[PDB]
Design an enzyme around this catalytic site. Structure first.
Site, PDB file in Angstrom:
ATOM      1  N   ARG A  47     -85.976  63.052  38.696  1.00 12.38           N
ATOM      2  CA  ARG A  47     -85.039  62.580  39.684  1.00 12.38           C
ATOM      3  C   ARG A  47     -84.073  61.360  38.796  1.00 12.38           C
ATOM      4  O   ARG A  47     -82.707  61.437  39.025  1.00 12.38           O
ATOM      5  CB  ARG A  47     -85.591  61.844  40.464  1.00 12.38           C
ATOM      6  CG  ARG A  47     -86.644  63.013  41.321  1.00 12.38           C
ATOM      7  CD  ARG A  47     -87.598  62.280  42.470  1.00 12.38           C
ATOM      8  NE  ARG A  47     -88.866  62.116  41.667  1.00 12.38           N
ATOM      9  CZ  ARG A  47     -89.978  61.216  42.102  1.00 12.38           C
ATOM     10  NH1 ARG A  47     -89.905  61.384  43.441  1.00 12.38           N
ATOM     11  NH2 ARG A  47     -90.985  60.935  41.455  1.00 12.38           N
ATOM     12  N   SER A  48     -84.782  60.654  38.032  1.00 19.17           N
ATOM     13  CA  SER A  48     -83.693  59.509  37.272  1.00 19.17           C
ATOM     14  C   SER A  48     -82.505  60.403  36.476  1.00 19.17           C
ATOM     15  O   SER A  48     -81.534  59.925  36.381  1.00 19.17           O
ATOM     16  CB  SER A  48     -84.659  58.875  36.214  1.00 19.17           C
ATOM     17  OG  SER A  48     -85.497  58.295  37.053  1.00 19.17           O
TER      18      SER A  48
ATOM     19  N   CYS B 178     -87.969  56.693  38.174  1.00 25.14           N
ATOM     20  CA  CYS B 178     -88.931  57.408  39.057  1.00 25.14           C
ATOM     21  C   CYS B 178     -90.103  57.269  38.728  1.00 25.14           C
ATOM     22  O   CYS B 178     -90.800  56.023  38.529  1.00 25.14           O
ATOM     23  CB  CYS B 178     -88.316  59.011  39.303  1.00 25.14           C
ATOM     24  SG  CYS B 178     -88.080  59.723  37.618  1.00 25.14           S
TER      25      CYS B 178
ATOM     26  N   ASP C  63     -90.888  64.675  44.077  1.00 24.11           N
ATOM     27  CA  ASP C  63     -90.978  64.727  42.676  1.00 24.11           C
ATOM     28  C   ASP C  63     -90.896  66.418  42.253  1.00 24.11           C
ATOM     29  O   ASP C  63     -91.365  67.182  43.306  1.00 24.11           O
ATOM     30  CB  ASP C  63     -92.313  64.307  42.348  1.00 24.11           C
ATOM     31  CG  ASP C  63     -92.326  64.129  40.737  1.00 24.11           C
ATOM     32  OD1 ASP C  63     -91.313  64.101  40.052  1.00 24.11           O
ATOM     33  OD2 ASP C  63     -93.482  63.823  40.150  1.00 24.11           O
TER      34      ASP C  63
ATOM     35  N   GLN D 129     -85.732  67.872  35.366  1.00 20.13           N
ATOM     36  CA  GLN D 129     -86.995  68.714  35.052  1.00 20.13           C
ATOM     37  C   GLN D 129     -86.978  70.136  35.476  1.00 20.13           C
ATOM     38  O   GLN D 129     -87.786  71.030  35.144  1.00 20.13           O
ATOM     39  CB  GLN D 129     -88.096  68.162  35.734  1.00 20.13           C
ATOM     40  CG  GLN D 129     -88.609  66.526  34.589  1.00 20.13           C
ATOM     41  CD  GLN D 129     -89.550  65.864  35.152  1.00 20.13           C
ATOM     42  OE1 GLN D 129     -89.548  65.366  36.596  1.00 20.13           O
ATOM     43  NE2 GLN D 129     -90.789  65.676  34.793  1.00 20.13           N
TER      44      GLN D 129
ATOM     45  N   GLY E 228     -89.492  58.813  34.955  1.00 21.66           N
ATOM     46  CA  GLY E 228     -88.209  58.352  34.405  1.00 21.66           C
ATOM     47  C   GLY E 228     -87.120  59.620  33.705  1.00 21.66           C
ATOM     48  O   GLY E 228     -86.525  59.000  32.757  1.00 21.66           O
TER      49      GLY E 228
END
Ligand code: VO4
Length: 298
Positions: free
Chosen positions: A219-220, A213, A179, A260, A216
């Protein structure tokens, strides 16, 4: 062109600046349904909400789920990005999969990360222990699983108990993507992405693939940006015609916060540039990704 722009951003060490520049320009749309008091326990993260205009509605009652339709008009591919389902929203999650006719689910997190529970256990771990979601009247059965070194592919059977119609859902579960972090290599990311592509799950004959994820978006968002950029390049057969930052800004019209960290943005560039080699006709690089990713280990 991506290679030249990428080399420049490294050379000047300005990935952070490039990335806030995208944060600052990203769209801002209302999320009033997601913020309704009756929906607070349907949201995993206070600060991650779907926009009203692009949210997936359930055909129930209360139609709210934390999920967004990213419709990439020019690429002609849509995706559903969603948070990892909570204990009380696993039925909603599979209702959305059913209603949207999705064939594939891409999970980019683990259920436990970093001490905390990032996702409910929403699919069965044993063939002999199927799950029934009483509230949405759906049954879910683990049919088989192919466990690789850093990811797992599962065949599930989703059954609407009302009609007794059944569908095969493929589950693509990336196990080694931290993450707020990046995959171990472009090869291991692309090896996984091309497994999803080859399953037929991204075909326009099916509903949108579901990507999640924990929140969301991080990673998504990285997964969808890379896939969409490669597809745009594939349709034109022209790598230099893809503007990655404009593609990301287009996607953030449909869901806040996609990607992110600046390093996730940097990695997206790395994946697309490497994936361009396959797109522009060097087929052998796919099996090379399979090697570098060490999927066949343990
Ligand atoms: O579960 V994520 O923080 O990559 O949106």
């Amino acid at each position: 062109e991506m290679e030249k722009e990428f080399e420049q951003i490294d050379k000047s060490g300005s990935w952070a600046a490039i990335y806030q520049d995208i944060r600052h320009e990203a769209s801002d749309f209302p999320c009033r349904v997601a913020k309704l008091p009756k929906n607070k326990n349907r949201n995993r993260y206070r600060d991650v909400s779907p926009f009203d205009h692009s949210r997936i509605k359930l055909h129930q009652d209360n139609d709210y789920i934390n999920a967004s339709l990213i419709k990439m008009e020019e690429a002609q591919r849509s995706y559903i990005l969603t948070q990892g389902p909570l204990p009380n929203t696993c039925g909603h999650f599979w209702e959305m999969v059913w209603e949207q006719k999705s064939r594939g689910v891409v999970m980019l997190n683990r259920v436990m990360e970093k001490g905390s529970l990032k996702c409910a256990q929403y699919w069965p771990q044993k063939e002999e222990k199927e799950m029934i979601f009483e509230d949405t009247n759906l049954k879910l059965t683990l049919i088989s699983e192919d466990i690789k070194s850093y990811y797992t592919v599962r065949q599930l059977e989703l059954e609407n108990l009302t009609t007794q119609e059944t569908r095969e859902i493929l589950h693509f579960h990336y196990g080694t993507w931290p993450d707020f972090g990046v995959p171990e290599s472009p090869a291991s990311f692309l090896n996984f992405l091309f497994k999803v592509r080859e399953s037929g799950s991204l075909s326009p004959e099916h509903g949108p693939v579901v990507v999640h994820c924990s929140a969301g978006i991080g990673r998504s968002g990285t997964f969808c940006l890379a896939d969409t950029c490669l597809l745009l390049m594939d349709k034109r057969k022209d790598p230099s015609s893809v503007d990655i930052k404009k593609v990301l800004l287009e996607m953030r019209k449909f869901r806040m916060g996609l990607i992110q960290t600046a390093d996730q943005l940097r990695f997206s560039y790395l994946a697309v540039i490497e994936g361009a080699k396959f797109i522009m006709g060097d087929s052998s690089v796919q099996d090379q990704w399979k090697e570098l990713s060490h999927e066949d280990l343990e």
